[PDB]
Curated annotation (Swiss-Prot), chain B:
Coiled coil: none annotated. This is Fatty acid synthase subunit beta. [Alpha(6)beta(6)] hexamers of two multifunctional subunits (alpha and beta). It comes from Saccharomyces cerevisiae (strain ATCC 204508 / S288c) (Baker's yeast). Fatty acid synthetase catalyzes the formation of long-chain fatty acids from acetyl-CoA, malonyl-CoA and NADPH. The beta subunit contains domains for: [acyl-carrier-protein] acetyltransferase and malonyltransferase, S-acyl fatty acid synthase thioesterase, enoyl-[acyl-carrier-protein] reductase, and 3-hydroxypalmitoyl-[acyl-carrier-protein] dehydratase.
Curated annotation (Swiss-Prot), chain C:
Fatty acid synthetase catalyzes the formation of long-chain fatty acids from acetyl-CoA, malonyl-CoA and NADPH. The alpha subunit contains domains for: acyl carrier protein, 3-oxoacyl-[acyl-carrier-protein] reductase, and 3-oxoacyl-[acyl-carrier-protein] synthase. This subunit coordinates the binding of the six beta subunits to the enzyme complex. 4'-phosphopantetheine is transferred from CoA to a specific serine of the Acyl carrier domain by the C-terminal PPT domain. This modification is essential for activity because fatty acids are bound in thioester linkage to the sulfhydryl of the prosthetic group. Belongs to the thiolase-like superfamily. Fungal fatty acid synthetase subunit alpha family. Present with 17000 molecules/cell in log phase SD medium. The lineage of its organism: Eukaryota, Fungi, Dikarya, Ascomycota, Saccharomycotina. This is Fatty acid synthase subunit alpha. [Alpha(6)beta(6)] hexamers of two multifunctional subunits (alpha and beta). The chain holds residues 630 to 678 of 1887 of the full protein.
Amino acid sequence: PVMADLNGGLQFVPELKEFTAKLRKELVETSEVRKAVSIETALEHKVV
Amino acid sequence: VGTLSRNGKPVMEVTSSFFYRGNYTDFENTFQKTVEPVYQMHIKTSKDIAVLRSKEWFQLDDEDFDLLNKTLTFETETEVTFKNANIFSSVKCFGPIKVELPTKETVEIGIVDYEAGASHGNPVVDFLKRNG
Amino acid sequence: IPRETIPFLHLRKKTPAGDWKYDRQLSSLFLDGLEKAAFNGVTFKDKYV
């Protein structure tokens, strides 16, 4: 039999579940924060 | 606002409001100090803390202070000179930010320190009406 | 347990690569519990199975 490993080195990133879920947290945060700080600075401007 | 004092301590405040009927266009000699209602924000998330750090007018005594899951009260007065009926020639909105402790006693952690020239509104009280 | 020899009964440990190898130190703990079970014996009082 032939086992072909066409995984591209993801065996060697350790604790992949938490690592994946870090990356996803930091895009959702960085987006969500910057969407709220955007909306509020365009209701300040609209009041002043 | 009259303040009656005996032996150099306040006893009571008299608050009379008069009204000259007529037609005035004298907005250079006009002003209004209101004391706004006390606004309460529950800081749940880390965007709530970031939206608040956005605001130039949210001064903190220690900028490293942890806001997360704390409850904040904004005790705010706003002084306001005029230009016309609708446009303020100056806005000021100040007074202390307080955090609820686990006793339910509140304690001053911060200041509000909004200033401005020409303005069609007070952005602080708008922010706290929606968010608080 | 002679060094450079695996017992017949042994516990394993997951290595960061993700295989399970004979861990000597886990395996000792197990066999020491098993030595005492054999002399003194084990209780299961209050265990529900």
